[PDB]
Amino acid sequence: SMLYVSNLPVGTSSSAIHALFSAYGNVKDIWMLSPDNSAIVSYESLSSAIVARDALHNRPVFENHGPVQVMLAKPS
Amino acid sequence: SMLYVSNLPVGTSSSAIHALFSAYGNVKDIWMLSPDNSAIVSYESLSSAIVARDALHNRPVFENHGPVQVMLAKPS
Numbered sequence: 010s011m012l013y014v015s016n017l018p019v020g021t022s023s024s025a026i027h028a029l030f031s032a033y034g035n036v037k038d039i040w041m042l043s044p045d046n047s048a049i050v051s052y053e054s055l056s057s058a059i060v061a062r063d064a065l066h067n068r069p070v071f072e073n074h075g076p077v078q079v080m081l082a083k084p085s
Numbered sequence: 086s087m088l089y090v091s092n093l094p095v096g097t098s099s100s101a102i103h104a105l106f107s108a109y110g111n112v113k114d115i116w117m118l119s120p121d122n123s124a125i126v127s128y129e130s131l132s133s134a135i136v137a138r139d140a141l142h143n144r145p146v147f148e149n150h151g152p153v154q155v156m157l158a159k160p161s
């Protein structure tokens with residue numbers, strides 16, 4: 010399952026993304042889109058992607074930075 | 086490989102996206118992010134994602150609508 014994560018702080022590392030999203034399930038892959046301040050996060054299960062989306066979408070979880078956006082992508 | 090495709094015409098279907106990106110390689114999956122007018126497209130090979138990124142730059146698509154933006158997502 011794919012999450013598009015955006016409005017990340019400039020220079021957020023894949024390891025920081027991995028820590029943030031590992032709280033909700035098994036992260037299979039992270040692809041970085043640094044010129045967009047964004048990333049793609051893949052979970053093993055849709056149930057985990059849903060929980061992380063609900064938990065983190067439009068949340069300023071990084072201090073002194075704006076709210077991170079988290080959108081669940083619809084396959085097919 | 087994973088491409089993040091943005092600036093889609095509003096309402097663009099996954100069938101239309103599949104048809105466009107099939108011009109450059111075997112499309113493995115498409116995930117729609119339609120509230121963002123965006124999509125994630127995965128190719129079987131990296132060469133195809135590069136070809137697609139380069140060929141689509143400034144190219145009118147979907148009945149001569151505005152070009153789309155294509156960014157190659159780096160795995161980690």
Ligand SMILES: [Cl-]
Pocket residue numbers: 033034035036052053054057
């Ligand atoms: Cl999972």
